[PDB]
Amino acid sequence: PLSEKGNDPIDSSTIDSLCAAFDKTLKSTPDVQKYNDAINTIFQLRQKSESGKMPADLTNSEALKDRQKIEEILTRSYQDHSESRVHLSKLIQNDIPFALNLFEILSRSSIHVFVGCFSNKDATIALLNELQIRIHYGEDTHVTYLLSIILQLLNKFKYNFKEVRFLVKELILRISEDEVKSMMLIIFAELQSSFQKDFDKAVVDFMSSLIVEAEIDVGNDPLSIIVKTLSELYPSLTTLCSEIFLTKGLSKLFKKRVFEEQDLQFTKELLRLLSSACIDETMRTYITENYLQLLERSLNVEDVQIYSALVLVKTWSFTKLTCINLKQLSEIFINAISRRIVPKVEMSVEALAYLSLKASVKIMIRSNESFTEILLTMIKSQKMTHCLYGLLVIMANLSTLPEEXXXXXXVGAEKAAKEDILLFNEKYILRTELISFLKREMHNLSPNCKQQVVRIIYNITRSKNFIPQLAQQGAVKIILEYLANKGEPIRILGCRALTRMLIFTNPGLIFKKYSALNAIPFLFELLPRSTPVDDNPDEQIKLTDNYEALLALTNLASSETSDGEEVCKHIVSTKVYWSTIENLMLDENVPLQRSTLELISNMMSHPLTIAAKFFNLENPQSLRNFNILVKLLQLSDVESQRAVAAIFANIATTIPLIAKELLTKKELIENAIQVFADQIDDIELRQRLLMLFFGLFEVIPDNGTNEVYPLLQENQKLKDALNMSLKRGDSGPEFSAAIPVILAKIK
């Protein structure tokens, strides 16, 4: 040792034991007293008699300083050490009320610390107990905070309901208060998906308690709590509420309180229910069968005219009453929405989004130019979120014009509104550059809102003239970017839209930036398919669409832009797209078969993409297609012969080798010759046929003698039919010099 060495020995043992007790307090977790010390200090404040009432030194308003200070000291002792954390939980669970008084006036974020001090579910019961209380008595100011503890207390444990069921009662019992009603929907959503029918029924059970109370004529005023709770929880538990809204005598009890009593305020409250219940076609009908006389006499007091009407509209009960008519009935919503009574502005839209379905209204609205202007402004600038859908729905029903041998006999009333509608649209939709406007806000529009934009556009395309202008405003952008999402009917309608537009516009002035192969997928959807449909439910693809899409499809081929080669390539390429156009080439239906031939015709101008499909001829497939074309050379439908002739005309020139090979083919030659002479009448058809001949003889050596070609060399029909052409007329400005050069090779 060192200390046992001397006249005053201290035996090194009394020294270890010494540093041991100096080392024990020097080895175990630092700053814990300080923390628990500071905490106790805070918890000292509690000694203020009346339930540790928070002395107003702290509550007040400028005291935010002194609080933030307390919230930190608490959080500290809580998130640094476990020992300090454990302390804070003991002092809190020890005086749970005070504990609550203390925290309430702290930040919302402080809750995680209060709850984080509750170790296991069991320990939280003395707590839920106070909570049922503070809530029931409505004494405590800050409900939002107490109920936020609830929501977190819930989300953090696995409760049994037998322990939280009190929420239903206590929360419903305060439905009147917006601070609660709000925290209720939340706390309820949880309770729902966590106790399903166990909750689902405890609610119906409580509510039943209220309807019984109202039946006996006892209570704080049941009926109101009920009505208010029903309308409020209707969206959340649609199914449920109805199972209560029906309840035998309830339907009576409401009415009695509304008739044999003023309660103007109660009345209004009921009308807010009737409207909230308008879900399944059943309730709507129920509401009519049971609450019609109400809605009727209600429309007398302004305080309940809007709430009444809206019900009559959303239920269609207006079609009964001898006191109003569609004209007046709607004037109410048009009246108010004229930058006036803001409280009505929203529901009058929703109302008018319906009424603007029966034309009587449609006509009416496109007349009142001012209202239309308010609406137009109401959509754009306004940025009145929820009012958009209806305003956009009204702006779809408004722009909706009816869809529609020789008749030289003697009716034309339909030219009335037709005109009006194409007027309206051009006036307020196209000029107001509204389509252009929507182009920008599109990204944000609610899914539903978007759809209305697709209808507005679709309604514009019904009349070709507008297509051009509607294009610069970015429509083809809208529709196409939309179609790049999800098999609903709206989609086949926006598809039709896209097609009508690509038919009447220039592929350059549009796909001058965002490529074209993007439109192809959509166009084909309006054509037949060998693949197991798309999504499947419900709307059909009329034959008229096959025609329309074909027209637009051809257009996108015409262009001699490098983009065109690109388009054509894509078509003849994608095995499915070609297997389709190939089949439609043999369609017995004429508009189809010709447009398809007109498509192929155009594609042929960018050879390397389709050529090998008809003029290869070493290929069974091409040869097949080759002969088909040679027969269609003599189709009744003259507009098709032109296309077929066109085809043969081009490649025969564009690719000499082929021309030479055609000199061998009989039926090709015999037909081309015949129709050429038997239909010299047609100007295009002959103009075409001549080119073929210019090109064919073009690969026929004159001095070459050695090898000759009869069918064209001789054939008096062609020979003389060539001369009849030569005998002035419409031989064409160019292809004239050819005629004699050609006879220069005949016998």
UniProtKB/Swiss-Prot annotation:
One of its GO terms (biological process) is chaperone-mediated protein folding. Its main location: cytoplasm. GO terms for molecular function: Hsp90 protein binding; identical protein binding; myosin binding. Keywords: Cytoplasm, Phosphoprotein. GO terms for cellular component: cytoplasm. Gene3D superfamilies: 1.25.10.100, Leucine-rich Repeat Variant (1.25.10.10). The modification Phosphoserine is found at residue 17. It comes from the Eukaryota. It is found in: Cytoplasm. Required for mother cell-specific ho expression. Might be required for the transport of factors (such as ASH1) that promote HO repression from the mother cell into its bud. Present with 3410 molecules/cell in log phase SD medium. This is SWI5-dependent HO expression protein 4. The gene is SHE4.
